[PDB]
């Protein structure tokens, strides 16, 4: 791993095969589906002791085929709304003190009621496997079903998602709180994949049409009927190779516009969010960002959690690696040694990278204004020499973001003995933070690209030329002072 990967990688001919030779290489073995199933089988019966006829239904990453070494192990536990809420989570700590206190090997048992989904957290010693233990989501196994069916309806699937995947992992672009959760990732890949010229993957309205004689099943209100198995339906015509479908989707997911749009897997199509229609539908869809509708629950964004950071990083980063793909060194292999395809991708991204990905969010302003407000702060404020979304190139030949408060403390204290500089006002900030930079003090010493997109409004900092690599240093300065820049600037109106 990490060693053994990379080699194994560089080794085997084309991109495709990487991303088919990192899907063999992530996925579970047998002896680990067999400790896996082991567990459950342990599970089973400690929740049957307690649960006559209670089955145990193993979702998410281990049934989805999606699955990689060391991932959680879900568990589905199948046996006055207040009043509801708190049996449910009375029922939640019953089973949470069935784990902790019954069932053999177990510890680590913590019971999560304030989840979306309530939960009870659990770990195996003996096996040493971790996981979550849901009294009530049937949603996740009939979607979990679906991943897997979406995985046999293409052979292509599976690498994308791993590779797609393991370059999230990779990019940070996939995680808890404000990242992106593998499901909502797999989602993506799978919406890229309905969305192609031909259609690499159905849409889950054709699977839903499709269906089949008792293969009907409602959950929780929604419609989870979908073919049982790939064969009575007919394969992809789409005949755009691995790779290719990789650049595909960095570049489309770059070009896409995410806050403007609902992708919906079961239309297979981008529903327009502005104004109003999907929200005033299903009542319970909560808007951000990024919109990945849930193929069968359709009050729920799987992306609802994702900050406009998260997305601006994620765009970003796709737009990059679509930088990557065009070039020679993806495409083609490399004579003896050197890091090809699929490698830079999965590498560690650098710490200049990793700050330039992710955007700067500023205050809400006009297009115009803000841009205005910007290069009025860069020029002015700054000794930055600018040139012309937005974009504008900025050399800074000067260690303008470091030495301020020395020098603001020099002035405070010229000033508290005698007459200063200025322009007398209420504040005021501009000219006075102009002083301050100019009270610091033709090969350009750093020099950086700033860009705003259109929506949401927000700055992106990258690197051009960093002899001395400070660059990290201006961007998280920037990160602090950009904003209550136009903060201030906002109140002179
Ligand atoms: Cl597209």
Redesign the pocket.
């Known amino acids: 791993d990490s060693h053994q990967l990379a080699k194994a990688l560089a080794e085997a001919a084309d991109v495709g095969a990487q991303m088919i030779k990192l899907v063999g290489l992530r996925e579970l073995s047998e002896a680990e589906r067999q400790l896996r199933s082991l567990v459950v089988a342990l599970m089973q019966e400690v929740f049957t002791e307690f649960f006559p006829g209670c089955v145990v239904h193993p979702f998410g990453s281990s049934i989805n085929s999606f699955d990689v070494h060391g991932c959680d192990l879900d568990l589905f536990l199948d046996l006055t709304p207040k009043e509801e809420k708190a049996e449910g989570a009375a029922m939640l700590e019953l089973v949470g003190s069935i784990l902790r206190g019954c069932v053999p090997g177990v510890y680590r048992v913590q019971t999560v009621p304030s989840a979306r989904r309530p939960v009870v957290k659990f770990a195996h010693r003996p096996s040493g496997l971790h996981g979550d233990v849901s009294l009530s989501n049937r949603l996740a196994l009939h979607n979990s079903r679906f991943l897997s069916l979406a995985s046999e309806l293409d052979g292509r699937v599976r690498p994308l998602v791993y590779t797609l995947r393991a370059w999230a992992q990779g990019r940070g672009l996939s995680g808890s709180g404000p990242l992106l959760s593998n499901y909502a990732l797999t989602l993506l890949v799978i919406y890229f994949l309905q ?1 192609r010229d031909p259609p690499v993957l159905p849409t889950v309205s054709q699977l839903t049409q499709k269906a089949g004689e008792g293969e009907q099943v409602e959950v929780d209100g929604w419609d989870c009927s979908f073919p049982r198995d790939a064969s009575r339906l007919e394969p992809s015509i789409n005949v755009e190779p691995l790779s290719s479908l990789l650049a595909q989707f960095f570049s ?1 997911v770059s ?2 516009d995410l806050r403007g749009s609902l992708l919906s897997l079961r239309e297979g199509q981008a529903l327009p969010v502005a104004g109003g229609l999907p929200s005033n539908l299903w009542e319970g869809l909560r808007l951000g960002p990024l919109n990945l509708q849930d193929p069968f629950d359709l009050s729920h964004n799987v992306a609802a959690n994702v900050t406009s950071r998260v997305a601006g990083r994620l765009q970003n980063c796709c737009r990059a690696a679509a930088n990557y793909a065009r070039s020679l060194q993806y495409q083609r292999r490399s004579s003896r040694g050197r890091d090809w395809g699929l490698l830079p991708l999965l590498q560690p991204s650098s710490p200049s990278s990793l700050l330039s990905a992710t955007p700067i969010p500023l205050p809400l302003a006009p297009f115009t204004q803000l841009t205005a407000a910007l290069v009025q702060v860069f020029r002015e404020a700054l000794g930055c020499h600018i040139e012309q979304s937005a974009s504008w190139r900025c050399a800074l030949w000067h260690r303008v973001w470091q030495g301020r408060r020395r020098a603001r403390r020099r002035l405070q204290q010229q000033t508290k003995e005698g007459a200063g500089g200025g322009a007398g006002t209420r504040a005021g900030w501009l000219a006075t933070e102009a002083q301050v930079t100019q009270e610091l003090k033709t090969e350009p010493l750093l020099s950086f690209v700033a860009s705003v997109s259109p929506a949401d409004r927000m700055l992106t900092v990258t690197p051009l030329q960093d002899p001395q690599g400070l660059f990290p240093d201006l961007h998280h300065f920037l990160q602090v002072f950009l904003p209550q820049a136009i903060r201030h600037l906002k109140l002179e109106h």
């Open positions: 969305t489309a070009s896409w």
